């Protein structure tokens, strides 16, 4: 909408208070005009029609329980935008400040969230498996990262290239969570998953096997479920990324860590420069080695550590 930029206040899914950029014209809309061509958040009203209605509020205060998923989808999209801009010099998902659209209250008791090719979509969860999914900063940045991928590598969402797609979203969702400095960790979805159980999550990058995911190529899922294991085989790549950053020994292979900033630089360069729609794990290793080479030199510790991390998870 046309209007004036304003700033409201509300409470997120986890009961945390935060300011949000809005736009005023009769109502206050969840429309942040300060980031690129804007960040717009919509009410799907428990339906699956998209995007729904642009979120409108009478007083610019967002403290109703119904407001909570909208507050977080809107706020965390801005944080993710800031991450990509300040860290990678990237302006929104297309690199040209494309408007970012999200819808919340998608369907009834929907235990998921996704990037659909045009926008982000968040369920509220059924209250047992999940609370509203936009409540997780890693979840929001994971979905938004699918958009980055769509516009760069274009990784097909199937088999090894789909597993890499997933891993890329997990890696950058985590890097955004650390950038925000909000109880950061190497788990995925811990803030929104199973409100009745503390300390679990959907996926672990530091130890994927904790939740049944492979941490070595020899243990890869070879069947057809989950698009050929895109959220399962992502474990092998998530583990490699974790090792590159934090180091460690894994299957008797030692890795010297080079930190989160360099992991981010190396994988962003890989994603934007070398990966293709049909890249497999072997090609991701080559892409990451080439990227580390471009950035730090071929005899660098950074290049050595990438090779070691990929060796550790059995990817040559
Ligand atoms: Ca209000
Ligand atoms: Ca966390
Ligand atoms: Ca996390
Ligand atoms: Ca839990
Ligand atoms: Zn995903």
UniProtKB/Swiss-Prot annotation:
Top-level taxon of origin: Bacteria
Catalytic site positions: 143, 231
Keyword field contains Hydrolase: yes
Temperature-activity note from the record: Thermostable.
Positions of Zn(2+) binding: 142, 146, 166
GO cellular component term, pick one: extracellular region
Cofactor requirements of the protein: Ca(2+); Zn(2+)
Cellular compartments annotated: Secreted
Reaction(s) catalysed by this chain's protein: Preferential cleavage: Xaa-|-Leu > Xaa-|-Phe
Binding residues annotated for Ca(2+) 1, in chain numbering: 57, 59, 61
Cofactor note text: Binds 4 Ca(2+) ions per subunit. Binds 1 zinc ion per subunit.
Enzyme class, first EC level, given as a word: hydrolase
Documented EC number(s): 3.4.24.27
Keywords: Calcium, Hydrolase, Metal-binding, Metalloprotease, Protease, Secreted, Signal, Zinc, Zymogen
One biological process term in Gene Ontology: proteolysis
Residues annotated as binding Ca(2+) 4: 193-194, 197, 200
Entry binding sites for Ca(2+) 2: 138, 177, 185, 187, 190
Residues that bind Ca(2+) 3: 177, 183, 185, 190
Molecular function terms from GO: metal ion binding; metalloendopeptidase activity
Key word ATP-binding present: no
Main location group: secreted
The protein's role, per its UniProt record: Extracellular zinc metalloprotease.
Family: Belongs to the peptidase M4 family.
UniProt-recorded name of the protein: Thermolysin
Residues of the full protein shown: 233 to 548 of 548
């Amino acid at each position: 909408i046309t209007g004036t930029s304003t700033v409201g206040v509300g409470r997120g899914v986890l009961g945390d208070q935060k300011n949000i950029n809005t736009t005023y014209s009769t109502y206050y809309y969840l429309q942040d005009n300060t980031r690129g061509n804007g960040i717009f958040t919509y009410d799907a009203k428990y339906r699956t029609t998209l995007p729904g209605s642009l979120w409108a509020d009478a007083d610019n205060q967002f403290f109703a329980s119904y407001d909570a998923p909208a507050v977080d989808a809107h706020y965390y999209a801005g944080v993710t935008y800031d991450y990509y801009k300040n860290v990678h010099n990237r302006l929104s998902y297309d690199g040209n400040n494309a408007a970012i659209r999200s819808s919340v209250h998608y369907s009834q008791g929907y235990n998921n969230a996704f990037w659909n090719g045009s926008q982000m979509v968040y369920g509220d969860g059924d209250g047992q498996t999940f609370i509203p999914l936009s409540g997780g900063i890693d979840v929001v940045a994971h979905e938004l990262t699918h958009a980055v991928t769509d516009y760069t590598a274009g990784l097909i969402y199937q088999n090894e290239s789909g597993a890499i797609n997933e891993a890329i979203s997990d890696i950058f969702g985590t890097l955004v969570e650390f950038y925000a400095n909000k109880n950061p960790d190497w788990e995925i979805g811990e803030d929104v998953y199973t409100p009745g159980i503390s300390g679990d999550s959907l996926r672990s990058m530091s130890d994927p096997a904790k939740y049944g995911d492979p941490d070595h190529y020899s243990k890869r899922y070879t069947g057809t479920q989950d698009n050929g294991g895109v959220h399962i085989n992502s474990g092998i790549i998530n583990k490699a990324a974790y090792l590159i950053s934090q180091g460690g020994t894994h299957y008797g292979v030692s890795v010297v860590g080079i930190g989160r900033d360099k992991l981010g630089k190396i994988f962003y360069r890989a994603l934007t420069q070398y990966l293709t729609p049909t890249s497999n794990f072997s090609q991701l290793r080559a892409a990451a080695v080439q990227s580390a080479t471009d950035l730090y030199g071929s005899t660098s510790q950074e290049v050595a550590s990438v090779k070691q991390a990929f060796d550790a998870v059995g990817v040559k």
